[PDB]
Design a protein around this ligand. Sequence first.
Ligand SMILES: Cc1cc2nc3c(=O)[nH]c(=O)nc-3n(C[C@H](O)[C@H](O)[C@H](O)COP(=O)(O)O)c2cc1C
Ligand SMILES: CC(C)CCC[C@@H](C)[C@H]1CC[C@H]2[C@@H]3CC=C4C[C@@H](O)CC[C@]4(C)[C@H]3CC[C@]12C
Ligand SMILES: CCCCCCC(C)(C)c1ccc([C@@H]2C[C@H](O)CC[C@H]2CCCO)c(O)c1
Length: 431
Amino acid sequence: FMDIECFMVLNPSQQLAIAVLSLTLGTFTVLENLLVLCVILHSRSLRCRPSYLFIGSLAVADLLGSVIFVYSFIDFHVFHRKDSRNVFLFKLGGVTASFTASVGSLFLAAIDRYISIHRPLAYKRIVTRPKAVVAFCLMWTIAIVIAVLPLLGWNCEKLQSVCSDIFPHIDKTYLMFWIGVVSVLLLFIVYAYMYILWKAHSHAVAKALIVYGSTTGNTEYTAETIARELADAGYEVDSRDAASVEAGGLFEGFDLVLLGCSTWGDDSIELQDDFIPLFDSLEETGAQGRKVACFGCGDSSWEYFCGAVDAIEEKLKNLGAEIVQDGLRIDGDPRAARDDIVGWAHDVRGAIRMDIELAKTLVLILVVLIICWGPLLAIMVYDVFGKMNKLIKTVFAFCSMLCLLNSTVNPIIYALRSKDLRHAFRSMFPS
Ligand SMILES: Cc1cc2nc3c(=O)[nH]c(=O)nc-3n(C[C@H](O)[C@H](O)[C@H](O)COP(=O)(O)O)c2cc1C
Ligand SMILES: CC(C)CCC[C@@H](C)[C@H]1CC[C@H]2[C@@H]3CC=C4C[C@@H](O)CC[C@]4(C)[C@H]3CC[C@]12C
Ligand SMILES: CCCCCCC(C)(C)c1ccc([C@@H]2C[C@H](O)CC[C@H]2CCCO)c(O)c1
């Protein structure tokens, strides 16, 4: 047991500074989530299809969290209210339940969006309306139950233990548990949105595989400017001489595969020597319905014009084909056929990044979270292991406003971005 006055670290200037932040951020949170709660109700009186579970839950948790926290905080730090062990822990249970319910609502919103990116086909089977409804109802009950623990025994005074140097009458073990659960589901939100951000960057650039087998380098000079036009169009190009390749699924993870081989053999129709081991090894390779386009050098003087392109086009059509366009068939010098090679390169590219505005919003979320939870929960971790000075206490007071800004910025992130809610609000005006 300690004294109420030890937890009131603010001076007449620090108190005014705080009251400003508490009542500005607080009033805007109260009013913002109210308008969101109003428009959700109006929307469900016209069109029933939109959910509003992860938008409404957060609107409740924020508004409630705000009224209780803003009022409690100011009454303790400005009015200097000295309340009973169970009376304090009751007002405290008000912020713990509400702020947990808030972060848990951002958690289920993130598990929804993670399932939609990871398994989009299985998402409609697993993420369903009746499963989702239960999820918020059990989110809320568990959150309340965590906040009810200090009032019915799990406190520093009843359980003769080490008291919190930031939270009056709270047991250090209750704190470690709450930081535990809060951190647990807070870190998942961070991972889920990192996964979604990763998955989107892999698709931003189309990966291209240009393999060529050339003798006098005439198909090399072709492939060099086939790869040039593609790299120019934002392609993750990787040109490989058929003399230095691996038949072990060479084409795996490639959007567009290009096989450039030169037509050789004097008496008969023959492939390039480099492309010869790669041709037989097409089975061991993937090409399992891959977008494959063919090219190659030959001569109009020769009986079988670019037959090597044909033999490949035939062997690919038997397997997964998906032949984007009819094979490019240049003569002895592609030097003047420059226009034809780039011309075919354009239309073969012509037959086939990442939604940055949505991806920006996911980056903002993490930025906001790291700023509003990181420092706050860091001072909470300090108290857990040992003591803390007057400075650490006063810094925590201004770190408390951090998550009040989070309560304010939330409607602007999720609700305001909802096309469904945006139209539902516009509805309320005359025609
Ligand atoms: C011995 C020999 C045989 C050839 N046979 C053919 C052929 O059957 N069909 C064809 O279209 N071109 C044929 N050509 C022409 C080649 O395709 C031409 O040299 C080509 O531009 C070489 O390209 P590369 O440097 O990529 O091998 C032949 C050329 C040589 C030297
Ligand atoms: C005072 C605070 C800390 C305790 C919360 C108690 C009350 C107000 C809670 C407990 C049960 C809660 C409900 C549980 C489930 C949901 C589903 C969600 O999609 C929207 C909010 C909604 C409908 C909650 C609204 C607020 C609620 C009625
Ligand atoms: C395990 C308990 C978690 C508490 C949530 C942390 C939170 C950021 C919400 C918080 C809660 C309480 C305070 C103030 C700590 C002061 O020491 C005493 C007055 C509290 C506000 C009154 C709550 O009813 C806080 O700054 C941050």
